[PDB]
Amino acid sequence: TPEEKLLRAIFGEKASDVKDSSLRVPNGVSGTVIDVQVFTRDGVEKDKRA
Amino acid sequence: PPDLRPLVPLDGGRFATSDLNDLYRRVINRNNRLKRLLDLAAPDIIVR
Amino acid sequence: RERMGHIELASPTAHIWFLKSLPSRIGLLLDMPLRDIERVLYFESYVVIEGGMTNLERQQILTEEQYLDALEEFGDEFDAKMGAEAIQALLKSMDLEQ
Amino acid sequence: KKRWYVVQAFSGFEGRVATSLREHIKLHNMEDLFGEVMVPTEEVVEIRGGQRRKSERKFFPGYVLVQMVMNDASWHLVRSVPRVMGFIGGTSDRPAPISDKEVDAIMNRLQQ
Amino acid sequence: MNLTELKNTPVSELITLGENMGLENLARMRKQDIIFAILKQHAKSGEDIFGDGVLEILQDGFGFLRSADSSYLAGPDDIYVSPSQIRRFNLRTGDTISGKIRPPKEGERYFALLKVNEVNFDKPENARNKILFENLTPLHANSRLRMERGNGSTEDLTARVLDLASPIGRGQRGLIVAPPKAGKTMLLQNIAQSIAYNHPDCVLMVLLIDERPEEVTEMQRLVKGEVVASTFDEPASRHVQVAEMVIEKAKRLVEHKKDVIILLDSITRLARAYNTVVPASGKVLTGGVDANALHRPKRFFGAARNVEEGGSLTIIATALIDTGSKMDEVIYEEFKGTGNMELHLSRKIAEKRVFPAIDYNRSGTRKEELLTTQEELQKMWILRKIIHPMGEIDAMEFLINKLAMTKTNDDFFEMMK
Amino acid sequence: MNLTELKNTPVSELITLGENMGLENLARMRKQDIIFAILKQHAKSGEDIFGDGVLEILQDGFGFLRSADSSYLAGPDDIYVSPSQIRRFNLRTGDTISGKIRPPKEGERYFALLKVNEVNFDKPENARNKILFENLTPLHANSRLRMERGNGSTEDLTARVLDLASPIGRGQRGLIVAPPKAGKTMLLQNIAQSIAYNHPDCVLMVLLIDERPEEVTEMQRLVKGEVVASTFDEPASRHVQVAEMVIEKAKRLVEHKKDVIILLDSITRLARAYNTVVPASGKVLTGGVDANALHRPKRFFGAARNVEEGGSLTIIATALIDTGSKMDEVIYEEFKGTGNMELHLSRKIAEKRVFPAIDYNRSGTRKEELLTTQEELQKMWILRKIIHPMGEIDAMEFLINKLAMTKTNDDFFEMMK
RNA sequence: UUAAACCGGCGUGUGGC
DNA sequence: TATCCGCTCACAATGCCACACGCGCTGCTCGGCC
DNA sequence: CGAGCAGCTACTTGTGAGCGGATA
Ligand SMILES: Nc1ncnc2c1ncn2[C@@H]1O[C@H](COP(=O)(O)OP(=O)(O)O)[C@@H](O)[C@H]1O
Ligand code: BEF
Ligand SMILES: [Mg+2]
């Protein structure tokens, strides 16, 4: 409904974002991160870490 | 049944599919074309 | 998983498992070798049914020129279906006890 | 007599297959033995209304049955152009075309 | 038979007719669902049903025959129209089509129209060979549509005042700018009644968008003609659906050389729905309206025009002000410059229980000389000259008193003497 | 053959011509779609079609030949122009090109122009070796363009008053500042008619942006010359398209040493469209206008100039006031300082049915001594001296009475004696 | 109607035994 | 008109385990019953 | 308008049986 759209717009850019959709380490393997690699598509805004 | 030949969500236009689905697709397409050809009084060699 | 559907085909079709099993089941049932049935099912040849007063045998196969030249001798009483329909008609009118 | 022989081809480019067949006719000035293409893919919807105008101007099986009085050199011509998947017809490879009643039928399909 | 022939009557006659047809309990399902079941049984009796409706074209190419009494909306009795008819005749949106229909076989959806028998109350041959609507030549209002009733009612003045403020004619584009609680409802009511009584030749098509259902019921069974409406019960999708459908029906009826009056209230809610159903262009305007949110409203508004060849389309869409926010006012602005006919109503005088409170000052008509005779135009010019130098309350009380002291408008001219 | 040759005539002759061509039912499709189908069949007859149109350049490098009768907009008969012509001759936007065209093969889009035969009514050799428009030397109005008709009509005064208020000449930049319901329509109408009748040498190019379609039809078939317009039926995109296209056509025609009069109404709606189609700079001005929203309007306005070498471009763009909001007034302000020719119209006198109500006080022309002879300039100075010390109503009634009591302007001078 | 609790299909290549 | 001789095709080829990767682009035509 | 079709190998070897076939 228009109220939902105007509400999610006035509260920033938020929706049914509850999707975890995050990568974790596979169950059983430890380690220490030593290098991060990120590559963006032309046009997408680069985050500060990139 | 569809559970035996699944279409799991592979991202993008690329899709992880079963093999039988393409055969069923082709068979249904040919069957629909044959059903629509007989009504249009199509040539005998064409329906053959 | 247990519930399934079906496909209504406008034209009959022959099952390949009884065609090229070596030996076949339809070829032995019709007393006809596999090559003639193969030529019939793929529309390079015909097969006649309900011979009767004609000079031709029923279980024989015909080609395109054979169906052309043999059409003028008998028009109404002569029946020559082509494809899986002809095979189905042969199977329907085939007795077993005799 | 220039009969109307039916032929199947590499589909998808069927119109371009017809144009290439025509180019091959006009190359060897084969219009003596040959006629035209008769690709009556002419279901002619033009519902150019609001929110959508892309109408399907083409609907017919991928057959481009050509009028010609057949010769074996003509057969090897129509097979020499690429995209000729099947020259159908009951035969070894020298078929008999469709009758004239289906010529009237295809005239109906063209007019519609 | 015809669906509307079963629709003019309440659910009670439909129930007893279904009992005559020998079916399941009809009162349980909806009355339009009752009509669907009844037509299904009537088709089961071995007869071809005769249906009618205006055409709605989807992306697939087929059509739906929406009925008049169903407010031009989706229903179980919407006749399916195969694409072959759109290939033969190419019936566009809004074409009133009547013809033979068959029942839906199982796994199908609705009734299918076999052969058209009537195209827009004319032979089907005129449907293919015809000049289109956006292809016409728009013109100004040549013929004048008088508004006064002629027997001197109290709200008859509400028509006379228009004929005294700014005339209305065929093909005009009228706006009604009024705040809430001003008197627009009764105004358009008596306007429709006067158009129907004094000018029964033209096709009265009253329109209602997002109002009370009681208002819809009061409008449908009070005025002459078809009354299609879409209240708040339907979202912006069905709002824009019914709007474009009635506008295309009017386009087709003008193509058939007929006059169509479209009294719409309100245009601001229609604009809100349009702004709701437009894709975002990554930017907003002043008030909270998208950039391309006005294109389709402007199209719907400018569909009205006067034609050289035949027929006219005159829309009177009410504009709403005093809503507190900007966007609605923005709409109003974007609509003062496109319409060639303004009419402004007063709420500051309506709160004084002074009706009807029409703004005589900012009312006007472009090319109004074609809307009235010569000497009547001179007398109206002199009358506006008299009305101008006095105050607002002065002009309005003078209007109401001296027009209720009169009965008709030419009698008013002959009394001012 | 030529598209305009099939366009000057209505859809009826197009229908019978298509019936002569033996095609599908033509009346069903649009009349411009009829022309597309008809030209397709004419090309099927084995002949090279001869087309013409003004060039529109996209980002890809090819061009479109937009036709005059199609209001310089997108159409199915827009001739495709291969980039090779832009490589050989480098035809810029607005260049009227006529040449041989071929039908579109399937999977193509439109007709393709093979070889140019006429470039701006001149040989193609002048197209490559030519001095450009923004490369010219702008000057003031040297030659005077008289406005009075000469037979003494009632609206002939509406021209005379200009010649009595502030002269108009070639290469000038004119503004018409007027509120709504003031008399701008008939004013520009008789202005165009007088320019055409008294000065048929110059190219009359009347322009209309976002008005009623009836107004467009009244303008097209009343005045001499090409009438391209874009009503509210088209969004800001097509508005800016037609605007830049007519301005580039005028630029090219002045490059070819010809005089172009551009009567535009209104400039405020054009500025609104421009402000609608500019990228947001994260800030807004007073009234609700973007920062860079004025650059392209200012370019379009200053395109008018008088040239040393040949030709002139004189634009008369009407400014709109009394709109209630600020932004429009802002436009007006940003436009008083760029134009060197102001003309102000009165609505406070127009409501009194006193026409024509031109503001004689705030009207004026910069370097007006080059616009009129010596002693006529002395007499105009003395006449403005007489007009000044009396009131507004006094000056205006004196104007209208004593000029309707006259027939021509020099006769008016000889009667004031 | 209400309350509580819970919610790798295919091919390919390589290597090893 | 029966009996070997040779042509032609189907069917099969250890089992596990571990790791890794790649399963495409664009134009046309057909399907139409939310 | 969406979806599906489509256009841009040659050393495996054995074992076995079914089907001409040719030759008296
Ligand atoms: N020169 C004139 N003579 C007579 N009437 C005029 C004249 N100029 C304007 N009018 C009146 O003005 C009205 C049209 O106004 P319009 O041109 O639309 O105003 P604007 O264009 O400034 O909004 C007509 O009804 C006409 O009676
Ligand atoms: F009302 Be006018 F056309 F500005
Ligand atoms: Mg105007």
Side-chain angles (χ1 to χ4, degrees):
Chain A
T1 200
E3 182 45 55
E4 293 273 309
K5 297 174 173 298
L6 274 297
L7 199 57
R8 68 155 304 179
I10 202 57
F11 280 109
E13 42 271 29
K14 182 266 297 177
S16 178
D17 207 326
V18 287
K19 308 292 293 186
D20 200 316
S21 64
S22 178
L23 174 61
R24 281 87 180 277
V25 301
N27 199 346
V29 55
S30 164
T32 297
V33 56
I34 59 173
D35 191 8
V36 59
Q37 294 298 142
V38 61
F39 298 106
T40 182
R41 170 173 275 271
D42 294 29
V44 194
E45 192 267 352
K46 294 186 177 183
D47 204 359
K48 69 182 64 64
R49 201 150 165 87
Chain B
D3 290 340
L4 315 184
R5 36 173 191 85
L7 292 183
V8 291
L10 185 51
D11 53 347
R14 191 41 69 180
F15 54 98
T17 178
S18 88
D19 192 288
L20 267 45
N21 296 22
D22 272 297
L23 287 84
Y24 299 138
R25 213 169 54 168
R26 294 169 59 171
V27 162
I28 297 182
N29 267 318
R30 296 301 170 176
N31 189 25
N32 290 327
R33 290 177 61 170
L34 196 141
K35 184 180 179 181
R36 294 183 65 156
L37 271 179
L38 60 90
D39 193 16
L40 265 65
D44 169 59
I45 193 67
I46 288 190
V47 308
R48 280 177 182 200
Chain C
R1 305 172 178 276
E2 53 269 19
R3 289 199 192 161
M4 50 189 295
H6 78 299
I7 293 176
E8 282 286 341
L9 310 99
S11 161
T13 174
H15 203 293
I16 197 59
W17 276 29
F18 316 102
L19 294 182
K20 308 188 64 59
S21 60
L22 198 73
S24 174
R25 293 302 167 269
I26 309 187
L28 186 54
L29 183 52
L30 271 72
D31 209 6
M32 181 189 315
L34 180 52
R35 191 54 59 182
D36 312 290
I37 311 182
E38 189 84 357
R39 296 171 182 266
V40 161
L41 280 175
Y42 294 166
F43 314 132
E44 294 95 12
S45 314
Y46 299 83
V47 63
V48 305
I49 42 176
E50 288 98 14
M53 66 200 305
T54 181
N55 50 309
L56 52 89
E57 201 261 340
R58 176 173 189 174
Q59 289 300 326
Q60 78 182 89
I61 70 165
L62 290 195
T63 176
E64 298 281 340
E65 58 90 13
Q66 272 168 345
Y67 183 59
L68 191 145
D69 284 338
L71 189 149
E72 299 176 344
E73 291 82 350
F74 306 93
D76 58 79
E77 66 94 11
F78 172 69
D79 313 325
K81 300 175 188 173
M82 194 201 51
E85 304 173 355
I87 308 299
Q88 185 176 358
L90 276 173
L91 271 60
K92 181 188 308 175
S93 45
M94 169 170 292
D95 199 68
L96 305 183
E97 299 179 345
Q98 295 303 126
Chain D
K1 178 215 169 307
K2 318 182 56 50
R3 271 285 184 178
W4 291 28
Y5 291 90
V6 175
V7 59
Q8 186 44 240
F10 284 176
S11 184
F13 263 60
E14 205 48 52
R16 271 83 58 205
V17 187
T19 49
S20 49
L21 206 172
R22 293 190 301 116
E23 197 82 7
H24 284 220
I25 305 151
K26 319 318 178 292
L27 171 49
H28 206 177
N29 42 69
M30 207 46 180
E31 50 205 281
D32 185 339
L33 273 291
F34 292 9
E36 59 280 353
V37 308
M38 309 148 195
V39 56
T41 178
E42 284 306 318
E43 300 300 319
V44 199
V45 51
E46 314 286 4
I47 176 69
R48 309 273 169 181
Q51 183 260 346
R52 175 177 173 279
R53 295 193 190 178
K54 291 188 173 182
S55 86
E56 169 210 6
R57 289 182 178 178
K58 303 198 205 173
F59 173 84
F60 196 79
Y63 298 90
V64 64
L65 72 164
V66 170
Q67 171 181 177
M68 58 155 197
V69 50
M70 204 158 69
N71 175 277
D72 301 0
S74 78
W75 200 89
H76 296 303
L77 177 153
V78 308
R79 295 294 308 193
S80 59
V81 54
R83 287 80 68 86
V84 193
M85 216 189 307
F87 200 100
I88 70 182
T91 177
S92 158
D93 300 78
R94 193 258 312 162
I98 205 57
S99 89
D100 313 328
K101 274 293 309 304
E102 291 303 319
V103 183
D104 312 282
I106 203 54
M107 185 280 317
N108 307 298
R109 289 286 155 270
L110 163 67
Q111 181 266 334
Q112 72 93 10
Chain E
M1 225 43 185
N2 200 289
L3 20 163
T4 37
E5 176 259 350
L6 301 179
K7 286 178 178 296
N8 20 13
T9 150
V11 63
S12 274
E13 213 178 358
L14 291 171
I15 287 165
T16 162
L17 196 147
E19 291 161 347
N20 223 349
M21 302 317 292
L23 295 174
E24 194 265 331
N25 290 319
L26 283 93
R28 198 63 254 192
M29 63 188 65
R30 291 179 293 277
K31 116 238 249 202
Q32 109 264 358
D33 252 334
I34 281 181
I35 301 171
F36 175 71
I38 278 178
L39 250 359
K40 278 205 61 179
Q41 182 58 35
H42 273 288
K44 289 166 194 175
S45 46
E47 60 170 357
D48 38 73
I49 318 185
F50 290 91
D52 55 345
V54 322
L55 196 51
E56 175 177 339
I57 283 100
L58 285 87
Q59 60 321 10
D60 261 306
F62 68 93
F64 276 108
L65 288 186
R66 320 290 183 178
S67 82
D69 262 341
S70 56
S71 70
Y72 286 166
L73 270 182
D77 348 68
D78 292 352
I79 298 83
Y80 170 82
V81 172
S82 160
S84 344
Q85 300 184 10
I86 299 101
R87 269 60 158 173
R88 284 181 295 269
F89 303 92
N90 222 24
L91 300 167
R92 292 200 301 178
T93 305
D95 279 312
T96 85
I97 300 311
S98 144
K100 171 191 305 176
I101 59 179
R102 70 162 175 81
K105 325 183 197 292
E106 103 310 331
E108 290 184 8
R109 312 192 299 136
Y110 310 106
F111 294 74
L113 179 79
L114 284 81
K115 164 171 174 60
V116 58
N117 308 130
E118 192 177 25
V119 183
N120 296 351
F121 320 105
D122 204 75
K123 60 183 175 66
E125 290 302 318
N126 195 31
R128 289 177 291 145
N129 184 6
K130 66 173 303 183
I131 146 106
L132 304 188
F133 188 84
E134 59 304 70
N135 277 95
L136 303 163
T137 61
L139 286 125
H140 300 259
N142 47 9
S143 96
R144 156 70 174 274
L145 286 178
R146 202 148 306 277
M147 297 302 309
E148 66 154 8
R149 196 72 59 84
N151 30 344
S153 328
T154 302
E155 337 234 20
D156 166 54
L157 269 62
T158 71
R160 295 174 61 195
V161 287
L162 189 148
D163 297 327
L164 241 349
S166 330
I168 242 340
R170 306 185 193 271
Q172 203 96 62
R173 183 149 47 250
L175 284 95
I176 303 274
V177 182
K181 188 57 62 101
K184 280 190 296 301
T185 311
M186 13 217 56
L187 189 64
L188 62 56
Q189 289 181 6
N190 329 120
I191 287 312
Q193 209 67 324
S194 29
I195 289 174
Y197 183 86
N198 308 118
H199 311 258
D201 53 325
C202 164
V203 173
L204 202 52
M205 196 35 155
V206 27
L207 211 50
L208 301 143
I209 272 261
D210 208 293
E211 301 109 316
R212 290 90 193 178
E214 45 267 15
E215 299 275 87
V216 190
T217 63
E218 183 178 1
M219 289 296 307
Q220 183 180 3
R221 62 149 115 98
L222 185 137
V223 335
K224 216 227 221 159
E226 191 178 314
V227 185
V228 167
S230 71
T231 176
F232 43 83
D233 273 347
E234 299 107 350
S237 61
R238 324 197 61 169
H239 281 308
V240 79
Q241 202 68 308
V242 304
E244 77 188 279
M245 280 279 280
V246 51
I247 211 63
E248 298 286 324
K249 176 194 177 182
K251 290 169 200 224
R252 302 304 98 85
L253 199 57
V254 180
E255 284 178 351
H256 275 266
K257 306 181 183 301
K258 290 193 179 179
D259 306 317
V260 189
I261 296 288
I262 300 292
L263 311 173
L264 177 86
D265 144 77
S266 110
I267 199 66
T268 62
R269 311 193 183 279
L270 176 127
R272 292 175 187 179
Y274 264 114
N275 178 79
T276 313
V277 289
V278 270
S281 48
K283 85 197 290 202
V284 98
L285 272 138
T286 107
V289 176
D290 202 302
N292 62 314
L294 267 294
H295 162 261
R296 300 261 307 277
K298 280 173 162 175
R299 298 273 309 282
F300 169 81
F301 198 64
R305 55 193 60 179
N306 204 28
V307 193
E308 195 134 285
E309 285 78 15
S312 334
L313 177 52
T314 305
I315 66 163
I316 311 295
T318 64
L320 232 114
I321 64 181
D322 281 346
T323 100
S325 117
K326 193 55 193 179
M327 82 285 281
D328 312 326
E329 304 288 4
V330 181
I331 302 309
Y332 152 73
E333 275 200 58
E334 304 322 322
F335 282 169
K336 42 102 136 206
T338 158
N340 53 11
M341 174 55 196
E342 297 42 39
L343 233 153
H344 302 258
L345 226 137
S346 229
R347 153 167 216 210
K348 186 259 290 179
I349 323 174
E351 56 90 16
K352 210 188 175 180
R353 281 131 203 83
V354 178
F355 306 100
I358 297 102
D359 236 12
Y360 208 93
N361 308 325
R362 210 189 309 99
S363 32
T365 303
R366 307 183 177 272
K367 312 297 182 177
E368 59 174 343
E369 64 277 356
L370 275 79
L371 275 304
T372 249
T373 102
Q374 269 329 63
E375 160 291 327
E376 286 192 345
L377 181 79
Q378 259 85 38
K379 278 270 298 260
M380 287 182 58
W381 276 351
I382 300 305
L383 236 91
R384 296 184 187 177
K385 213 209 175 139
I386 300 207
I387 265 171
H388 157 256
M390 64 178 65
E392 222 223 22
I393 300 324
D394 221 352
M396 301 289 187
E397 61 99 3
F398 201 90
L399 235 164
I400 61 170
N401 199 306
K402 165 172 252 269
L403 276 196
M405 238 223 328
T406 317
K407 159 175 181 326
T408 59
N409 54 4
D410 307 344
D411 210 44
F412 171 66
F413 295 149
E414 201 228 53
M415 216 201 319
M416 287 200 78
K417 246 252 282 206
Chain F
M1 225 43 185
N2 200 289
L3 20 163
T4 37
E5 176 259 350
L6 301 179
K7 286 178 178 296
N8 20 13
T9 150
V11 63
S12 274
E13 213 178 358
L14 291 171
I15 287 165
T16 162
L17 196 147
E19 291 161 347
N20 222 349
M21 302 317 292
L23 295 174
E24 194 265 331
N25 290 319
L26 283 93
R28 198 63 254 192
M29 63 188 65
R30 291 179 293 277
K31 116 238 249 202
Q32 109 264 358
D33 252 334
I34 281 181
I35 301 171
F36 175 71
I38 278 178
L39 250 359
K40 278 205 61 179
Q41 182 58 35
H42 273 288
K44 289 166 194 174
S45 46
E47 60 170 357
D48 38 73
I49 318 185
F50 290 91
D52 55 345
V54 322
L55 196 51
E56 175 177 339
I57 283 100
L58 285 87
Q59 60 321 10
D60 261 305
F62 68 93
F64 276 108
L65 288 186
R66 320 290 183 178
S67 82
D69 262 341
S70 56
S71 70
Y72 286 166
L73 270 182
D77 348 68
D78 292 352
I79 298 83
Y80 170 82
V81 172
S82 160
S84 344
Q85 300 184 10
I86 299 101
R87 269 60 158 173
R88 284 181 295 269
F89 303 92
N90 222 24
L91 300 167
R92 292 200 301 178
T93 305
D95 278 312
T96 85
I97 300 311
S98 144
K100 171 191 305 176
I101 59 179
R102 70 162 175 81
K105 325 183 197 292
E106 103 310 331
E108 290 184 9
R109 312 192 299 136
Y110 310 106
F111 294 74
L113 179 79
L114 284 81
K115 164 171 174 60
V116 58
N117 308 130
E118 192 177 25
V119 183
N120 296 351
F121 320 105
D122 204 75
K123 60 183 175 66
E125 290 302 318
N126 195 31
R128 289 176 291 145
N129 184 6
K130 66 173 303 183
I131 146 106
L132 304 188
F133 188 84
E134 59 304 70
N135 277 95
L136 303 163
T137 61
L139 286 125
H140 300 259
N142 47 8
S143 96
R144 156 70 174 274
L145 286 178
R146 202 148 306 277
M147 297 302 309
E148 66 154 7
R149 196 72 59 84
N151 30 343
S153 328
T154 302
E155 337 234 20
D156 167 53
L157 269 62
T158 71
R160 295 174 61 195
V161 287
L162 189 148
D163 297 327
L164 241 349
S166 330
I168 242 340
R170 306 185 193 271
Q172 203 96 62
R173 183 149 47 250
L175 284 95
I176 303 274
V177 182
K181 188 57 62 101
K184 280 190 296 301
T185 311
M186 13 217 56
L187 188 64
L188 62 56
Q189 289 181 6
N190 329 120
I191 287 312
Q193 209 67 324
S194 29
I195 289 174
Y197 183 86
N198 308 118
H199 311 258
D201 53 325
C202 164
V203 173
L204 202 52
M205 196 35 156
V206 27
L207 211 50
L208 301 143
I209 272 261
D210 208 293
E211 301 109 316
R212 290 90 193 178
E214 45 267 15
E215 299 275 87
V216 190
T217 63
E218 183 178 1
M219 289 296 307
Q220 183 180 3
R221 62 149 115 98
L222 185 137
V223 335
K224 216 227 221 159
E226 191 178 314
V227 185
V228 167
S230 71
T231 176
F232 43 83
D233 273 347
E234 299 107 350
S237 61
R238 324 197 61 169
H239 281 308
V240 79
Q241 202 68 308
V242 304
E244 77 188 279
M245 280 279 280
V246 51
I247 211 63
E248 298 286 324
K249 176 194 177 182
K251 290 169 200 224
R252 302 304 98 85
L253 199 57
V254 180
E255 284 178 351
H256 275 266
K257 306 181 183 301
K258 290 193 179 179
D259 306 317
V260 189
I261 296 288
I262 300 292
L263 311 173
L264 177 86
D265 144 77
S266 110
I267 199 66
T268 62
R269 311 193 183 279
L270 176 127
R272 292 175 187 179
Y274 264 114
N275 178 79
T276 313
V277 289
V278 270
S281 48
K283 85 197 290 202
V284 98
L285 272 138
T286 107
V289 176
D290 202 302
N292 62 314
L294 267 294
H295 162 261
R296 301 261 307 277
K298 280 173 162 175
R299 298 273 309 282
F300 170 81
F301 198 64
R305 55 193 60 179
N306 204 28
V307 193
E308 195 134 285
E309 285 78 15
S312 334
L313 177 52
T314 305
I315 66 163
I316 311 295
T318 64
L320 232 114
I321 64 181
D322 281 346
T323 100
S325 117
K326 193 55 193 179
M327 82 285 281
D328 312 326
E329 304 288 4
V330 181
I331 302 309
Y332 152 73
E333 275 200 58
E334 304 322 322
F335 282 169
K336 42 102 136 206
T338 158
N340 53 11
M341 174 55 196
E342 297 42 39
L343 233 153
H344 302 258
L345 226 137
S346 229
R347 153 167 216 210
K348 185 259 291 179
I349 323 174
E351 56 90 16
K352 210 188 175 180
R353 281 131 203 83
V354 178
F355 306 101
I358 297 102
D359 236 12
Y360 208 93
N361 308 325
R362 210 189 309 99
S363 32
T365 303
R366 307 183 177 272
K367 312 297 182 177
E368 59 174 343
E369 64 277 356
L370 275 79
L371 275 304
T372 249
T373 102
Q374 269 329 63
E375 160 291 327
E376 286 192 345
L377 181 79
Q378 259 85 38
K379 278 270 298 260
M380 287 182 58
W381 276 351
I382 300 305
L383 236 91
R384 296 184 187 177
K385 213 209 175 139
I386 300 207
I387 265 171
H388 157 256
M390 64 178 65
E392 222 223 22
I393 300 324
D394 221 352
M396 301 289 187
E397 61 99 3
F398 201 90
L399 235 164
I400 61 170
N401 199 305
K402 165 172 252 269
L403 276 196
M405 238 223 328
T406 317
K407 159 175 181 326
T408 59
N409 54 4
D410 307 344
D411 210 44
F412 171 66
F413 295 149
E414 201 228 53
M415 216 201 319
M416 287 200 78
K417 246 252 282 206

